[PDB]
Every structure is written in structure tokens, then in C-alpha cells.
Symmetry: C6
């Protein structure tokens, strides 16, 4: 009977901008051009869930190998191997063999892991008619399971389409856009919460930096 | 004997539209993601029920009824209660996790609930033909309808297929323009066939109370 | 210097901009984005001919029903029903629920109703070759014709397929330009073969008396 | 220098440094209502009236009757010129490219014409256009060919090849400045000779095209 | 030894190119209609003959030989005389096309006239392949070649298919841009593999003596 | 510096090791993309040449268009004698230029094993390009090679490479630009991303001279 509740990301600044965190039991699209911090955001969401709340996490990777995910996270001071060893984090490898794709079977394997590891948080990294239907099915199944999910997507322009197929930002309940804008010859990273269905959030772009401690969203407007 | 209007009671809108939405006709409400389309179409029905006891049918193609109900709690509205009382019907035409068939279901619901208001949320040749027929059928039935559509640019095409704004009698455009790192929401009544309305963009906000439009 | 004869539209300001009205016995393309006043222009052309000159007219419609056309015209205080009753106006319904048939139908109505004025509302290679054929036989009848077309940008091609402007004798563009959140309606006579006309855009409004252009 | 024929279109022979190169073809490209047909007609009319140079006008869409009627408002009696055998309007307007070429050739020989106006896949267009230009040359005709374009500052003509195939290229523009239209003419290219460069304003009046260099 | 260059003697160009065109390679010269591509390619051969008694072969696809000759009279160049003397040869390649035959002919002409200089005037995937082949086979002959190509925008892709600038060793862009209602011609050497050149656009005019470029 | 997660090898290209905070990540691939004549080939040759001269690390250069002869001739612009390094067995130029990705990959592997190579330069549907590039990157990684892969782009500001996928499957992305503004060209280099560490951000000016690329951080 209440308006939708939120789970804290504990990503510095983010829970302020979102007025409490990510909407629980829903999926949030996080879209951005190359090297904008999408994998970082997805990982920091699980990592903080484990460390701060003992909420287990599942990370589903479609291209980066688990071993590279674990190695690159040490850049932010995080030991994911340790969390995997303890059974608090599971990295599901859906990356292709370096020798169509069945999202329906993949979903069942994601569910196994969620149940096995008792996970509350899920990150998934990363023809428009077909994209829309398939993305719709995935979002719906995750909701049914009860997971709170970050889903990354790619885009190719800083102030153009939200994602690549012009449908992702309509099927998603929540949309966050990471940008990396070239101003003069300098880059400025910003985060925007474009929409959160059924709840409030701050509007427009907020600058952030990536540091040895992950994402740092500057004190706000 | 010129066309009459039905009040939305959406604060600011009945002013811009000089009395509300043209009765017995369909209004397209187009907008990029998160612009307020669902909210407008829910507030249309909600106010019709609460202010005028005019029952409403909400047709959903993606969002589940459960999520529409949950999301409307953001605004302190209890849509489950209105459904339970028979004032509101949320018609689930979502896909599993035929345009004539859909029309027959909408007609059945309109008769069942004695509804006066409908919201529908949400090749150009085929699209234009199908939309025209949906619009014509709703008119024959007597529905006053809000139909939302998606668009991908704030100052580009009105909707996706470049035809929707031409077969619709009325067109409303919601915008969410990003400038200098800040967003500004606006509402425009682009066209109302056979009647008058204010022109250009009017600022609005979405708060705990729903849509507020400022002239 | 033999002048191309024109017939007065009596649309306020237009006969000034066109130096006497529309070229008689020819077709004028009237193109615009949604809700720019295309149908209004085409109806005002017929209405004024009947009321001012006892020149009967035929309105050919492809999407709006005659009933809605008549209803919307009440916005401007025009009783089109009465004119149809008196055989001064014929609304030809060419709506779905070949071009050859339509043309003979239009020819038939022109002969039957003594009509001098005609309004038609509303792959590029295909459009070009049979838009040209339509112009040719209307000219053969001796009709003076307004034909509306859609376009989707205010400053893009004249009409949707990028050919219509080249096969028409005469071209008029209605714009509804959005700048700084405000809209400005303008009318431009782009071309009138064989005769002079004022150039560029002229602002107009749509009010209770229809189109008012300010030269 | 190469020999040029005077168009006698006010201002144009100055911009082209003496007129159009004889025996060569000139593209005249513009958006709708920019004056392409007018330029075409004036080129023939002046050749006849001033220089007793007969002309052939080839039309693909506008009918001969309309061309004549439309010219009348400039005070030009084309029917009279057709009656005297000084002008031939060749109707190719609708209900073989080689068949048209031999129709043109035949009319040129028959009327002893020195001036021609033709109004109006990339691979095949370029191929078919190059073929047309190539044969007019062999004949010795001096030709104006109009083409359509859809933007004032954009490709020269509809298919992005026309300007590369033609010896000479003239662009007629009709540009919006604020809400006002301004007509200009530009000679982009004239192979083998000098010309004035850039855009020059013109008006269309009761006396045809008037360009101010 | 780094790649050597041969002087074009086109005024200002040898300064911009730091010595002329790289020997034994092809230079792409691209530009919109009427930018001076043919004139650059002719002036290259004409100066070859006049200044260095280096015979030249001009390969034409659009213009007839007769028109090439007539159009150069503008500049006081008597190409008819150069053809009569056997110093210039104009190879007519005007109208299922495939490159392999044309090369024999070019080669034929090159040894026949003892030519040092060549000018060729004028699916992206196939264009890239076929251009690559032409460039390679010309290189095998040892010819120094100017090959012109079209583009449709002053500040867009180097050439028409978006691949020509990548397979060419050297690239020169001629522009004809609107300044007000006036035109400004400029020449840019975009790239010369394995050697140096000045950067950016340099204005030029076309006069009764052909191309005149001002580097300073 | 020390407190970063990913080991790097120095390019010894003036200024680049500063911008990349230590050089190119070892055992990984770096995309180097740029319009025509931006310096892609020079960068990828300079990478190998410096590896050999400074650290006696052998390199393999894979060329898909330029012939070995021309690669060698063009490098003389900079005073580099690549023929001598090829004679000495320190450099191998693999000629894959025209008169099967799997066969190519096996050639590369064979050369890398045969020449004991530590540095590799490769010069130069969307998701068929994507999965083929992905495959290529994965295999070089399993070998342990550190790779520079150049790609083309057609606008200075616009897509990173031709197919809009190359920048997402690469671990590291460098963009070379050659911007024309007010009739003048200025060259810049940008490291857009390096997975797993920091790096200087934005564009940095550079020149190409008789000494190769000189970048000013
Ligand atoms: N209580 C609230 N206070 C302020 N804003 C709110 C509140 N609840 C929701 N919103 C806003 O309403 C937006 C959602 O509005 P919707 O009507 O769902 O938009 P939409 O255009 O239908 O988007 P789709 O269908 O997801 S593309 C959220 O993104 C919030 O910005
Ligand atoms: N009494 C009135 N006062 C002022 N404006 C009016 C009045 N009645 C109608 N209008 C305007 O006229 C417009 C309708 O013009 P139409 O001629 O129907 O446009 P249209 O170009 O034919 O649009 P289509 O066919 O729907 S794309 C409406 O959108 C109103 O803005
Ligand atoms: N007597 C006149 N006085 C002034 N302007 C005139 C006169 N007669 C014609 N015009 C103008 O000339 C224009 C037509 O010129 P054309 O040469 O027919 O144009 P066009 O470029 O051939 O256009 P098309 O073929 O219709 S796309 C008309 O649109 C008028 O603006
Ligand atoms: N004597 C001259 N004085 C000045 N300009 C001249 C002279 N002769 C020719 N021109 C100019 O040179 C231009 C022709 O140059 P070309 O080299 O033929 O151009 P192009 O780039 O090859 O064009 P194409 O192949 O027709 S697209 C003409 O358009 C004139 O502007
Ligand atoms: N000695 C030198 N001094 C200065 N600049 C030079 C020197 N040698 C070469 N250059 C420059 O280096 C550029 C070539 O760089 P490359 O590395 O071949 O470019 P690229 O990006 O690989 O271009 P492609 O493959 O031809 S698209 C030339 O265009 C010259 O500007
Ligand atoms: N310790 C650190 N300090 C500062 N910046 C860092 C640090 N570690 C990594 N980065 C930055 O993080 C970026 C990578 O972030 P990711 O989250 O991998 O981006 P991404 O959007 O997932 O990019 P992809 O998937 O390769 S397209 C690098 O390009 C660096 O700029
Ligand atoms: Cl940062
Ligand atoms: Cl708001
Ligand atoms: Cl108005
Ligand atoms: Cl004028
Ligand atoms: Cl000049
Ligand atoms: Cl430099
Ligand atoms: Mg990532
Ligand atoms: Mg919605
Ligand atoms: Mg209409
Ligand atoms: Mg014409
Ligand atoms: Mg040329
Ligand atoms: Mg290279």
C-alpha cells in the first residue's frame, strides 16, 4: 500500500540524487558511451550491498571475463575474489567463447544463482522490435524473482539517444545516464537520473569523478 | 454547436486548452522517456472519477496493472480502491513475460463500466492505417480518449512513425529539455481540430500531487 | 504581356500576397506540418467561393469524415450542412472504412454540382508520376483546385516525398515555427508558375473568422 | 579563348565573361520555383529574336501549351515563333533515352537549331547523363539542362553526380533570410574559361530574369 | 634514404609539400565540382615536360582529349603541340568495368613515351579494393601519379566513398568555400606517408597561368 | 605510479607514458583510432621500435594494406632502420596485405612464438565485427602479448571507429585527432579509457617530426 521503497547504493552522492537509492525489486538501466563508468557503477552497487548490508550479489558478465572483472576492481580497493570465496558474490560468466543467444535459458541460470547465493542485488553488464520484446521479458522475470537490478547499456553519443536501439529507455522502470563530455579539450563526467517510475529524484546532470574509491558524485546543485 | 470539451482538472491544463479535452475524440500525448505520459493519462481518468463520477478505462500494453497501481501511490492515489468499486478498469493488454480484437475488448470494457474516459498507454503505411481505425472506432463508441506515444528527440518528430500527429484530432507534446545540465519539463497543445487553445510550451512540474502546469 | 487569370480566395490578406488569388484552372499545393491550417485554407477557399461568388465547390476528403469536417467548420461559424443541403457544396467521401476511379468520381461531382472550385485534402518515383496525372486531368476539367499535403519539418522539403513541389503549378507553405517556446504561424507563396506574387513568409493567425494573414 | 554565345539574360553574360561556351552543355540547378524554366526559355527566345538562332525546347513534364501560356506573361509570343519555324517545342511529357536523343537530333537538324534547352542509381544516372551530354556536343548544339535540387546549400543536383558530368554549372538559389526570400545566381564552373565567382542577386520581373553583378 | 620528391613547379605547391610529390607514388587530389582537379593534374604533366623534359601520360575518363586540349588554351599551354611532339600522351578511357586492362594500356603508354609522370582524371568495400590494386600496380611501374577524385562537401569526407583517403599514400584536398556570397579556393596537403609537408589550408587562385598558391 | 592495479609497459614515446600513467597495460590490447594521416601507423611502429631498442623486447608488426617494403621505407623518415631489425630477428613484419580470421590468428601466434615477441602491432553486421574483434583480442591476451590495434574513423568528433563497437570490446582506447579549425590543423592524442587504472583525461597536443611522435602532457 506504500509508494515504492528504495535500497541504498551507498555510492557517494547517489542516494541523495535518487532520494534514497534504487527502487527495490526493479531494474535500473545505466547507459553510457565507452569508459563512462558503467561496469564500475554495477560493481560498486553489489560490493556495497555485500559489505554494508550483507546482501549477496550476482554479477552477470557478457564480454569481460570474470578474471578481468576481479582484476580491474582492485583498482578501487575491492577484493572480489574474497567475496566470491565466501559465497557473498557470484560472477556468472555469459561471455562468448573466443572460438541466436538464448535469453530464456540464461534467465533460468541467473535464477539458480540468485537462489543459491540468496542474492538481493543483481548487475548485468551489459532489430529494435526484437530488442524491446527481449528486454521486456528479462525485466519482467527479474521483477518476479524480486531482484533489484542494474542493467548497463551502451550508447554512442553524449547528448543523443539514451541507448542503442531507441527502445531500452522505454521498457526500463528506471534510467540513469553516465556521460563523459568533451568540453574544450577537457572531459567532464556527469551522472543523470532521467527517470524513476513511481518515485521522485533530482533532475539533470551531476558531475562526478572516478577515484581509488570508485564513483564520487560531487556535492550537488 | 462547435465541439465541446471535458475538464481534465489537471491544474493549468484546462486553461491552456480553453476548457479541457474535446469530447468524443482522441488526444495524442507524445513525449520522450519519463516525460509524464502515463501520469497525464492516469490523472485524466482519476480526476474524471473523483471529480465527476465518470468511470475510466486504462489500457496498458507494457506496464502491469500491479505496477500502474503501485506507481500511482507516489501521488497518494489509491487506484486499487477505484478498480474495486468498479469506477476504474485497468485493461491488461501486456505481452506474455490483432487490432480488432483489442478494440472489441475496449468496447466491452467501456460498456461494462459505463466509462466516459479512456486512456491508452502507449512501415508508416500500416501504422497510419491502424491508428486511424482505432481512432475512428473510439469516436463511434463515444469515448473521450488520451493515447500516449513515444518520441526520441525533444525537438524532432512528434511521434515515432511520422504519421501519428496527422491522423489524431488533437495533439499534446510533453518535453523534458536538457540545457546547461538542467532539465525543464514543458507541455504544448500543438493542435485541437475544430476548436481553440493556447500556443507554445508551458512549463510544468511533477510533484506529489501529480502534474502542475503554469501559465 | 498576357496575364494568368486568378480567382479571389477572399481569405483575408491572401489575395494581396498572391496578387489576385489562385491561378484559375490550375492546382495549388498547400503544404504544412500538423495543425498548420491546411484543411481550414481548403475549406475557406470553397466556403468563400459559394458565399461571395455563388461558385459551388467540391471538397474531396481522404481521412476526415464529412461529419467531422462539417463539425469542425462550426468553430468559425460556418454552416456547411446548409450549403450541402442547397447543393452549393458537395463533400466527396474518399475514405477507406486506384486513382482512375476517384478521378471519374470527382469529374462526376464537378459536372453535377456546377463546381468551379475543388479542394482535395489531403517510393518518390511513384508519387511523382501519379500526382502529375492527378493535376493533369483536374486541369482538363478546368477546375481551380487546392490540394493539401503533409510535411514533417518547418524548413525541410516542401512535402513528404520531395517531389510534390516540383510537379505542382503553384506551391503554398504553411508553417508553424517553434522558437523560444512560442509558436508563429506563417504563410508563404513559394511559386506560382506564369505569374507574380509576394515573396517570403507572412504571419497569420487562426481565429473565429478563419485565417487572417498580415501582409 | 573559347567562343561563347550570348544569353542576353540581363547580367548573365557579364558573370560568364561573354556568355555560354558554344557547343557545350550547362547545368542549371535549383530548388522549386527558382527560375530554371524561365532561364531555359529566355536562352532560346533571345537567341531567336536577337540573333535569328533557332531553338529546340525539350520538356519532360510541363506541357507545350503551359510553357507557351506561362511565357506570355513576359510578353513573349512563343506560339508565333513556333508558327514561323524558329522555335520547336518537343513534347516528351508523360501520359528510351536513345530514342529521345534521336528525336532531339532530328529536330535540331530540321529547324537548324543552334540553341537547346532540356527542362529538366547514381551509377546509371551518371552514365545516362554523361551519354546525353556527350552526344549533344558531337552535334554542335549549345545546351541548357535544368535539374532539380532539394536544399539551397547542399548537393548541386538531385543525384550528386550531375555537376561533375556537366561542362558548365549554374546554381539558382532562393534563400530565406529571416522571413524574406532572396534569389541569387552562381556560376560554379565553366570549363576552359574564366567567369565571375560566388552568388549574384537577381529578380524575376515582367521582363524575365534580371541579374545584378 | 627517406622517400624523395619530384617538383611540380606549380607555384607555392613545392613549398607546401616540402619538395614536390613523393616519387614513384600516387597522390590523391580530391575536391568538389570546379575546384581545379583537372587543372592541377594537367599542370603537373605540362610542367614535367616544359621544365624537365619528362614526358607525361594523361588518362581521361570524362573529357575527350580534344576538350582537354581546348580547355588548356585558357592558360597559354599549347598541349596540341606537346601531343604532336610526342611529349604528352592523352589516353582516352571514356565510355562491366574492371581495372586490369586499363593498366596494360597505361603501362604501354608509359614505356612508349618514356613517361615519368601520370595523371588519372578521374559499395565502399569494393572501391577500397580496386583503388588499392590500381595504386599498387602503378607503384610497380615506377610512375609518379596524380589521381583526382570527387567529393560533394567542402568540409566532409575526403572523397566520395569514405575509403579513398585511407588507401592512398598521399592526399591533397582542393576546396571552394563560400565567404559571404564570395568564393575562396584553398589547397591542403592532408597527408604524405613517410615524409613531411606544411599543414592546413593555403589560399589559391586560378589565373591565366593556371594555379597560383600562396603559402605565406 | 605504484598504487595502480594493472602492470604497464613503457612505450618510450615522449609524453605518452605520462598520459597513460606508466604506459600500455601488459597482456592487453589498446585500440588506436584516427582519421587519415593522424599517426596510427607511426604510433604502432614506434611502439615496437622502442621495445626493441630500449628493452630488447622483440616485436611483431601485422600489416593488412601497406607492404613491408613501404612500412620500412616510410620509417626511414624518422631515422629508423627497420630492415636491420628484421635481419637481426628482433622485428618480424607479417604481411597480411592483399594481392579467414582463424588462419591469420595462427600465423600471428606462430610469429610471436618464433620471434619471442612481447609487443604486437596490428595495422589496421556491427556485431559480426564485434564478435570477430572480441575473438582477436581474447586470443592475443591468452598468448600474453601486449597489442596496439589501429582503426580508422571518418570524423574528428564522432564515432570512435568505423563500426561503433570497437571502443566497447577493447580494454584500452586511444584517439588520435587532426582537427582543422580556422584553416589550421592541430594534432592531439586522447586516452579515452584504460580498464583498471587512471590516466590523464582529454586531448593533449602532439607533433610528428623527424623523431616520430612527441606528445606534450
Ligand atoms: N512523487 C513524485 N514527485 C515528483 N516526481 C515524481 C513523483 N513520482 C513520480 N515522479 C516523476 O514521474 C516520472 C514518471 O512519469 P511517467 O508518467 O511514468 O513517465 P512516462 O513518460 O510514462 O515514462 P515511461 O512510460 O517510463 S517512457 C518519474 O521519472 C519521476 O520523475
Ligand atoms: N475558433 C478558433 N480559434 C482559433 N484557432 C482555432 C479555432 N478553431 C480552430 N483553430 C485552430 O485551427 C487548427 C486546426 O486547423 P486545421 O485546418 O484542421 O489544420 P490541419 O493543417 O488541416 O491539421 P491536420 O489535418 O490535423 S494535420 C487547430 O489546431 C486550432 O489551433
Ligand atoms: N510576370 C512575372 N512577374 C514576376 N515574377 C514572375 C512572373 N512570371 C513568373 N514569375 C516568377 O517565376 C517563378 C517561376 O519560375 P520558373 O522558371 O517556372 O521556375 P522553376 O525553377 O522552373 O520551377 P518548377 O519547374 O515549377 S520546380 C514563379 O514562381 C514566379 O515567382
Ligand atoms: N583562364 C582562366 N582564368 C581563371 N579561371 C579559369 C580559367 N580557365 C579556367 N578557369 C577556372 O577553372 C575551373 C575549371 O577547373 P577544372 O580543373 O576543370 O575543375 P575540376 O575540379 O576538374 O572540375 P570538374 O572535373 O568539371 S568536377 C573553371 O570552372 C574556371 O573557374
Ligand atoms: N619526417 C617527418 N616530419 C614530420 N612529419 C612527418 C614526417 N614523416 C611523416 N610525417 C607525417 O606523418 C604522417 C603519416 O603518419 P602515419 O602514421 O602514416 O598516418 P596514418 O594515421 O597511419 O595514416 P594512413 O594509414 O595513411 S590513413 C604524414 O601524413 C606526415 O604528416
Ligand atoms: N583508480 C582509478 N582512479 C581513477 N579513474 C579510474 C581508476 N580505475 C579506473 N578508472 C577509470 O575507469 C574507467 C573504466 O570504467 P568502467 O566502469 O570500466 O567503464 P565502462 O563504461 O564499463 O567501459 P567499457 O565497458 O570498457 S565500454 C577507465 O577508463 C579509467 O578512466
Ligand atoms: Cl574522473
Ligand atoms: Cl518536475
Ligand atoms: Cl493562431
Ligand atoms: Cl523576384
Ligand atoms: Cl580563382
Ligand atoms: Cl605535426
Ligand atoms: Mg564496462
Ligand atoms: Mg509510461
Ligand atoms: Mg487537415
Ligand atoms: Mg520549371
Ligand atoms: Mg575535372
Ligand atoms: Mg597507416
Amino acid at each position: 500500500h506504500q509508494a515504492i521503497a528504495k535500497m541504498r547504493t551507498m555510492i557517494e552522492g547517489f542516494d541523495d540524487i535518487s532520494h534514497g537509492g534504487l527502487p527495490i525489486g526493479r531494474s535500473t538501466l545505466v547507459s553510457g558511451t565507452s569508459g563512462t563508468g558503467k561496469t564500475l557503477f554495477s560493481i560498486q552497487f553489489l560490493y556495497n550491498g555485500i559489505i554494508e548490508f550483507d546482501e549477496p550479489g550476482v554479477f552477470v558478465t557478457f564480454e569481460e571475463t570474470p578474471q578481468d572483472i576481479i582484476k580491474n576492481a582492485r583498482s578501487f580497493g575491492w577484493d572480489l575474489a574474497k567475496l566470491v570465496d565466501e559465497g557473498k558474490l557470484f560472477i556468472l560468466d555469459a561471455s562468448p567463447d573466443p572460438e541466436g543467444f538464448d535469453l530464456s535459458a540464461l534467465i533460468e541460470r541467473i535464477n539458480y544463482a540468485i537462489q543459491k547465493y540468496r542474492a538481493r542485488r543483481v548487475s548485468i553488464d551489459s532489430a529494435s522490435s526484437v530488442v524491446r520484446r527481449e528486454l521486456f521479458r528479462l525485466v519482467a522475470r527479474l521483477k518476479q524473482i524480486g531482484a533489484t537490478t542494474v542493467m548497463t547499456t551502451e550508447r554512442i553519443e553524449e547528448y543523443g539517444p539514451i541507448a542503442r536501439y531507441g527502445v531500452e529507455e522505454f521498457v526500463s522502470d528506471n534510467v540513469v545516464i553516465l556521460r563523459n563530455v568533451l568540453e574544450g579539450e577537457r572531459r567532464r563526467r556527469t551522472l543523470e537520473i532521467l527517470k524513476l517510475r513511481g518515485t521522485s529524484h533530482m533532475k539533470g546532470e551531476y558531475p562526478f569523478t572516478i577515484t581509488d574509491h570508485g564513483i564520487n558524485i560531487f556535492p550537488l546543485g
